[PDB]
Amino acid sequence: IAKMRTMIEGFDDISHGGLPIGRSTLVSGTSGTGKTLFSIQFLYNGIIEFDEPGVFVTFEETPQDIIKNARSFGWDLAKLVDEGKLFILDALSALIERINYAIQKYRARRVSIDSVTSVFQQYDASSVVRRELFRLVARLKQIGATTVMTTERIEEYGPIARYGVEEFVSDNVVILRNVLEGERRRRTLEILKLRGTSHMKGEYPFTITDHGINIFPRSSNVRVSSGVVRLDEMCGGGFFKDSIILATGATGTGKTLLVSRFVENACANKERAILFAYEESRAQLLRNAYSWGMDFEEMERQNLLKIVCAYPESAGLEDHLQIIKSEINDFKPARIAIDSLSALARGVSNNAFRQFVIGVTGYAKQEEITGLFTNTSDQFMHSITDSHICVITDTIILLQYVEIRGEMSRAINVFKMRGSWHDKAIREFMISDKGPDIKDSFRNFERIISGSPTRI
Amino acid sequence: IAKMRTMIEGFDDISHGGLPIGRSTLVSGTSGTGKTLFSIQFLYNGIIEFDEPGVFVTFEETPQDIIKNARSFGWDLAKLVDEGKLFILDALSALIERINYAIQKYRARRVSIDSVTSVFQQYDASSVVRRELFRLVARLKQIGATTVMTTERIEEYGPIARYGVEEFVSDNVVILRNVLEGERRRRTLEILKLRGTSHMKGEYPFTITDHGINIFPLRSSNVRVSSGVVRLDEMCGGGFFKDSIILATGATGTGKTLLVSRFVENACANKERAILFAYEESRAQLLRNAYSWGMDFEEMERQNLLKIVCAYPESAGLEDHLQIIKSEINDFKPARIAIDSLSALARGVSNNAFRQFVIGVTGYAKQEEITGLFTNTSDQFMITDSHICVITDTIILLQYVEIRGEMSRAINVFKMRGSWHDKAIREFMISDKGPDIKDSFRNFERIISGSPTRI
Amino acid sequence: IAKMRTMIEGFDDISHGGLPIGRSTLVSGTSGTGKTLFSIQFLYNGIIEFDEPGVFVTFEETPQDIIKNARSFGWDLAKLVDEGKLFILDALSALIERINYAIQKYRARRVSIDSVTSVFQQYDASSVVRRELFRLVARLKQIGATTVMTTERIEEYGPIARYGVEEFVSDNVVILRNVLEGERRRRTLEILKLRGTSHMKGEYPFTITDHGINIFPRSSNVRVSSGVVRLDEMCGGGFFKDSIILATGATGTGKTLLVSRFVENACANKERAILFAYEESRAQLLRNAYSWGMDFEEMERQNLLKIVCAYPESAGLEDHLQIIKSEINDFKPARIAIDSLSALARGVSNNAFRQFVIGVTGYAKQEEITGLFTNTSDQFMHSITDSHICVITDTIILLQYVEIRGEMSRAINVFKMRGSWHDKAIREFMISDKGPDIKDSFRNFERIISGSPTRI
Ligand SMILES: Nc1ncnc2c1ncn2[C@@H]1O[C@H](COP(=O)(O)OP(=O)(O)OP(=O)(O)O)[C@@H](O)[C@H]1O
Ligand SMILES: Nc1ncnc2c1ncn2[C@@H]1O[C@H](COP(=O)(O)OP(=O)(O)OP(=O)(O)O)[C@@H](O)[C@H]1O
Ligand SMILES: Nc1ncnc2c1ncn2[C@@H]1O[C@H](COP(=O)(O)OP(=O)(O)OP(=O)(O)O)[C@@H](O)[C@H]1O
Ligand SMILES: Nc1ncnc2c1ncn2[C@@H]1O[C@H](COP(=O)(O)OP(=O)(O)OP(=O)(O)O)[C@@H](O)[C@H]1O
Ligand SMILES: Nc1ncnc2c1ncn2[C@@H]1O[C@H](COP(=O)(O)OP(=O)(O)OP(=O)(O)O)[C@@H](O)[C@H]1O
Ligand SMILES: Nc1ncnc2c1ncn2[C@@H]1O[C@H](COP(=O)(O)OP(=O)(O)OP(=O)(O)O)[C@@H](O)[C@H]1O
Ligand SMILES: [Mg+2]
Ligand SMILES: [Mg+2]
Ligand SMILES: [Mg+2]
Ligand SMILES: [Mg+2]
Ligand SMILES: [Mg+2]
Ligand SMILES: [Mg+2]
């Protein structure tokens, strides 16, 4: 069973090439799940790469309404119909005749029906839909044309179709969802089945952007500097180039300080860098940064630093990824920084957050980009990690508060360093008007990893 | 009631021999559960295993599509007509006649109907369905031919059939599921009932492969093997046991992958095949860190001795991961394997679904005399273990020890099943040639806390 | 209201003698709940003990199909019909006439209808079923014949009957269930009501075995040895004969060691013993046992030791009990051992597990059998007990890991000893190639029950 590519980033790897060739694919889902976006996108791409003639059988929508909406991603469907490359059939057993006729005058390639459920309200009685659905499918499989049929749905976790008898007739079943969890919508695609072929089971986080659908399913010894000399000395030549560094610690420990010095160092060696902040804003960052003797405003004047400030609850976790991606595909920084993940995990599913970290890490390492992700710990004085995904990070620079003689002092230590030597000493440090000052470690103190020390 | 082997791996143990002789079995479930697959496999295996006639009754789609769908597993229609061993009937009491025809025509034994739910569009009443259901099975039983019926379902945890009156008429009820939990689907088969016979109660994890369905049901020599480290072998009093399961738990960056790299290296060193299942790092990374310790993993794969199967834990489901391991070991056939790690496969997974995984790998690994070293990154570094350290025969736990404001690491053989081991928590270090197990801490107390005390 | 015995192990004590005499009993439940198994079992037993004439009114099942299925437990229904002791009436107001006629030619005793729901699909409309059900019941109560009526069900926790009007007509209501919790089926029986009589309320764990249905609703000073001399010295003459001993402790403490020495001691005094293992297999056990100088293979050669290895998730908790019972009813060991309960409680209901422990304990003590049950603790260094059923055990031999001068040493202490003196000292012990070596206790150490000790 040969498959037909749809040029839809994600769907090509989820269905292993695409959808069963010469067969009909049913795409069900609720309203605003992207049933039409996918439908025309299956034709557009098809009639832009392999130069294939595709006909669109519209029903409750006007042939200009479809083209007026496709202009949201800069798609000129008029120019498609101005070269006989796309035919829109405006709309009981005579409909297949016109489709069979049009497709004959437009050499059978890609066909989309939006929607079949619409022209079935006057029939109903469940058993009737199936009887008239089977005939349609069969009538298309005889002409051997990769057809996508749209179906309506009432529930996001209930009947597959309105009359629950379309999935049993259809050979291939793709379900588009828009689940709302904690007053936040999440678009997820899934391939229920695919007769005489293989596919990726379960649902994968996707979104609709200005390019349309966006479905989301080396290791050199090159070392880079973190901005701090002693830190690179503790890491035995600084952080690795293509690696993920983690800055875990309590509130006001110096995470954003290390991020600022990590981004500065990039711009210092004429290297581009992106800073994704979710806790503070450009205004505050510039002031805080300048207070340590760093010109963040100037760093952006050289087109070497970009600041993307936004709230962690502003958009969805499946969205935030796309922003980072598009932000990296444009500016093309050598290294990025996330401040912070703690803010991107608050009121989010433990699994939904795991898919995010895996995404950034993968993409960050896939493009050989150095990413310094910070994480704020709950207990300031310390268990381990909430979702404990410290196994994804190659380096772990944790900061801990140390109470010494009624003085709230801070300490830094390189907890982990994959395929690299590091200092296993909890060196004390302080903050000044020029960044960190890592001094000597606490040799005459015991139980330093348990908030409070002990005289020796 | 005579059994009938279907040659479906797992099913012949779940149904105790297979399905009842000259009885009608009902296989209900949702769409994509694998109802048609089972139906074909039942006849296919039955045809090329005991030269038995098979009659497939189609209803929804045509004989060509069904024949064109089995090509995904490598099954051809050479029995369809080129051997007259596969009779397909394209599609109330007139159907039964045609059924008895091909049956007595080719001295039939096996029969599959797919689907019967599609022949009850008009009849919107359960009364009619039951009446015309019983008559079918009753007829089929009069001919005493092992027939499999297929029905459709709306919910995975609701009515048995579409009209909920088919399981009561049917003698044997099989239910195929495709439950979706946490954006992840899991195919599970269960034998609801089986009249005048015994079977296994509850649902068993299965998958669909290119050999079709793979249902998953539910020695001890003193030969020792080297762990890669000499002191470690001395700590186990002769090295690791051959046909045994070793576990390495500890905080992130304790050196689990280090002990794995040496455990796999030692294999290839003695010209022994070993498989490495990574779910945290990738080949590129592992090769770098490995070489940094003075180990050439690339070379090890150049001699067809070491294999690396990197895959994100979240990529596939727990049931698929198992099949991937089994098939991977069925091809390469290593003398020992290593999983890095179990903790990476226990993330956003049910404790019951995870238990079934560890039991499988352990069982299968222990069933083929394969030495397995599974790692498990402990959540709270510097307590217990909310899982199963009872399954593992050996436990090599690594713990971080803070001494004089220095993040030092220690190792100890926590347990060694039916063997002597060192009961001392000796400090160790990592260099550019592997571990260096030094001496323990005699003048330090509460070393299990992660923070000792000057004695 | 006199009751009629059914000779069904469990149902006789649940309904206090049996079911209301001269009245009709409705048995509802889903498919494969054992509606037919019970139905014929009510006749078989009845026409095998009190020599009573019973007629079976079958519907959607053939008179040979019922007999062909009853042969799963070795029941010759043909021989029952070959002496006019059982009559099968193969199958609107004329059905009661034949039943009234047959029962007259087969002196009214035990009657079973399987099923009434079957011959009602052509009626439906809820109110119709009741009207035609009442007439049936009344027509049977007039002939005074203990009749059991089978009813179909869709839900395990929903309507009592298909039309939910059969329980209001029927005098007695028995509901058979097959609940699925965590991909595991559990058969439970219940008596909803019983007019003019008393019964046991709630549902009781049952199973179907080769004997059919299996519903599951002294104290001498005789002392026995545990295999260890010092252990018997710490128990002041060894464990009590008819008592339950518990071996709680962390992983690799020496639980299976004490079990092996406890089973060996039985075979040593020419006493039979059963070992129920769920963590290891015969292969490993024999090797581990032989490493301590115990010949487990030989112990089975004398027909004094039996090993029943099986996984704790292989079968159901309500099943595992039956296995132990049948295993003890055959071999008839003087003492048994369970290794372990921790494995039999993983992914099980806290209450469902409580009913198991009570079962083994009761049966173990009911047959005056000594049972050494082991339990693995979670924290290796220790709170108390998960489901804390240490109140069921008469003796508690807990083992605890003790870290001494960077050496992971082990310790044993007799925590409890009901109606017996015991040693209240945490004696240290080690393992060798001949079993345990209990030495002196830790006198110069403090906080030994909190993992880590303290110099004194
Ligand atoms: N240019 C755009 N940029 C971002 N999101 C867009 C853009 N255009 C549309 N969308 C999003 O995608 C949706 C359009 O999806 P589409 O029209 O295919 O829905 P549908 O599922 O076919 O709806 P219906 O059930 O009414 O037919 C919009 O509602 C909006 O959420
Ligand atoms: N080669 C293959 N590799 C992997 N999975 C496959 C392969 N071939 C088929 N499958 C899987 O098995 C499914 C086929 O099952 P099958 O065609 O029997 O469905 P079904 O349950 O009979 O559906 P229906 O409700 O339409 O009768 C596909 O949807 C896919 O999930
Ligand atoms: N100009 C300055 N001089 C001295 N110390 C400073 C100065 N500016 C900031 N600090 C110190 O360093 C800390 C700043 O660290 P930073 O702002 O990076 O916090 P953080 O660890 O990222 O915390 P969070 O993100 O939770 O607010 C302040 O709490 C203060 O102790
Ligand atoms: N010999 C046996 N050993 C063990 N279990 C058996 C044996 N025979 C039958 N069983 C079990 O008991 C069931 C038989 O129960 P029975 O036929 O009474 O069901 P039922 O509830 O009457 O079904 P229906 O609703 O279809 O009439 C089988 O499905 C199986 O689970
Ligand atoms: N070349 C090297 N030289 C010195 N020490 C090294 C070297 N490579 C690794 N290490 C040490 O070993 C640690 C990594 O060991 P390893 O990756 O096996 O640990 P792990 O517990 O499996 O980690 P993770 O939780 O990330 O899987 C580093 O943190 C460092 O302390
Ligand atoms: N031949 C031997 N010589 C010395 N010590 C041994 C020998 N065999 C086993 N041991 C020791 O005794 C322990 C065995 O105890 P046992 O196997 O009964 O463990 P357990 O407490 O039942 O643990 P679990 O059931 O959780 O695996 C081993 O961990 C080891 O310390
Ligand atoms: Mg639309
Ligand atoms: Mg900050
Ligand atoms: Mg099918
Ligand atoms: Mg690792
Ligand atoms: Mg029955
Ligand atoms: Mg044990």
Curated annotation (Swiss-Prot), chain B:
Source organism: Synechococcus elongatus (strain ATCC 33912 / PCC 7942 / FACHB-805)
Region (A-loop, interacts with KaiA): 446-455
GO biological process: circadian rhythm; entrainment of circadian clock; negative regulation of circadian rhythm; regulation of DNA-templated transcription; regulation of phosphorelay signal transduction system
GO MF entries: ATP binding; ATP hydrolysis activity; DNA binding; identical protein binding; magnesium ion binding; protein serine kinase activity; protein serine/threonine kinase activity; protein serine/threonine/tyrosine kinase activity
Further remarks about this protein from its record: 'Kai' means 'cycle' in Japanese.
SUPFAM superfamilies (alphabetical): P-loop containing nucleoside triphosphate hydrolases
Effect upon mutating residue 355 to C: Decreased endogenous ATPase
Effect annotated for changing residue 91 to L: Reduced binding of KaiB, reduced formation of KaiCBA, still phosphorylated
Outcome of mutating residue 402 to D: Constitutively hyperphosphorylated, insensitive to KaiA or KaiB
Modified residues (Phosphothreonine): 390
PTM text: Phosphorylated and dephosphorylated on serine/threonine residues by autocatalysis. Unphosphorylated, mono- and di-phosphorylated forms exist. The phosphorylated form correlates with clock speed. The presence of KaiA increases phosphorylation and stabilizes these forms.
Effect upon mutating residue 126 to P: Shortens the period of the circadian rhythm to 21 hours in reconstituted KaiABC complex. Increased endogenous ATPase. Higher CI ATPase activity, clock speeds up
UniProt: Mg(2+) 2 binding residues: 257, 280
Active site residues of this protein: 60 (proton acceptor in ci (kaic 1)), 280 (proton acceptor in cii (kaic 2))
Induction notes from the record: Transcribed in a circadian rhythm with maximal expression at 12 hours and minimal expression 12 hours later; expressed as a kaiB-kaiC opperon, this gene does not have its own promoter. Autorepresses expression. Negatively regulated by labA. Non-phosphorylatable kaiC mutants still down-regulate the kaiBC operon.
Temperature dependence: ATPase activity is stable from 25 to 35 degrees Celsius.
Pfam families: ATPase (PF06745)
Outcome of mutating residue 198 to W: Increases photoperiod in presence of KaiA and KaiB
Annotated binding of Mg(2+) 1, by residue: 36
Record function comment: The KaiABC oscillator complex constitutes the main circadian regulator in cyanobacteria. Complex composition changes during the circadian cycle to control KaiC phosphorylation; KaiA stimulates KaiC autophosphorylation, while KaiB sequesters KaiA, leading to KaiC autodephosphorylation. The Kai complex controls chromosome condensation, leading to a transcription accessible chromosome during the first half of the circadian cycle and a compact, less transcription-accessible chromosome during the latter half. Clock output pathways impact the RpaA transcriptional regulator. The level of KaiC phosphorylation and KaiC ATPase activity represent the key features of the biochemical oscillator. Phospho-Ser-431-KaiC accumulation triggers binding of KaiB to CI to form the KaiB(6):KaiC(6) complex, leading to changes in the output regulators CikA and SasA.
Positions of ATP 2 binding: 252-258, 293, 409, 415-417, 419, 421, 423
Effect listed in the UniProt record for changing residue 122 to A: Higher CI ATPase activity, clock speeds up
Catalytic activity: L-seryl-[protein] + ATP = O-phospho-L-seryl-[protein] + ADP + H(+); L-threonyl-[protein] + ATP = O-phospho-L-threonyl-[protein] + ADP + H(+); ATP + H2O = ADP + phosphate + H(+)
Identification of the protein by name: Circadian clock oscillator protein KaiC
NCBIfam families: circ_KaiC, PRK09302.1
